[PDB]
Design a protein around this ligand. Structure first.
Ligand SMILES: [Zn+2]
Length: 157
């Protein structure tokens, strides 16, 4: 049934910013920016947020990102009861990602299972695809990168 993604594999098998995947980068969103209004905090009790910066930034994301993440939170517990979805990186306020990263606009999250059992990540990535994320990439052994389209792209003119 559900086949895990392999290390470095991405679904769909196209570049992230293509229309069939997560679409175009709309630009960085910062706390001081006009675009900040676009982000809403996700306080789903079934999701662990690393929040290493202690700023709550990992929780701020677009509605579509929230929707897909919330659906994934359900499938993770269904796949491994007692284990929760965990976000290690979300909206990046400090340039820790490549130029034009969707993390800069709350459209991407790096995830793991709460038990940090890396053998579960290929399968987690698959659940992420079934959860509706527009692009899922088994980026590193430490996490799965998941991104979504901007609302402008979901209903493109
Ligand atoms: Zn990422």
């Amino acid at each position: 049934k559900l086949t895990p993604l392999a290390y470095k594999q991405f679904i769909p098998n196209v570049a992230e910013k293509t229309l069939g995947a997560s679409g175009r980068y709309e630009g960085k969103i910062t706390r001081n920016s006009e675009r900040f209004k676009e982000l809403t905090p996700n306080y789903n009790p079934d999701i662990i947020f690393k929040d290493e910066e202690n700023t709550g930034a990992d929780r701020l994301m677009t509605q579509r990102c929230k929707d897909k993440l919330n659906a994934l939170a359900i499938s993770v517990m269904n796949q491994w009861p007692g284990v929760k979805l965990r976000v290690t990186e979300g909206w990046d306020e400090d340039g820790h990602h490549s130029e034009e990263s969707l993390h800069y606009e709350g459209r991407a999250v790096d995830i793991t299972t709460s038990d940090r059992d890396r053998s579960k990540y290929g399968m987690l990535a698959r659940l992420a695809v079934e959860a509706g994320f527009d692009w899922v990439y088994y980026e590193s052994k430490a996490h799965i990168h998941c991104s979504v389209k901007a609302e402008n792209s979901v209903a493109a003119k």
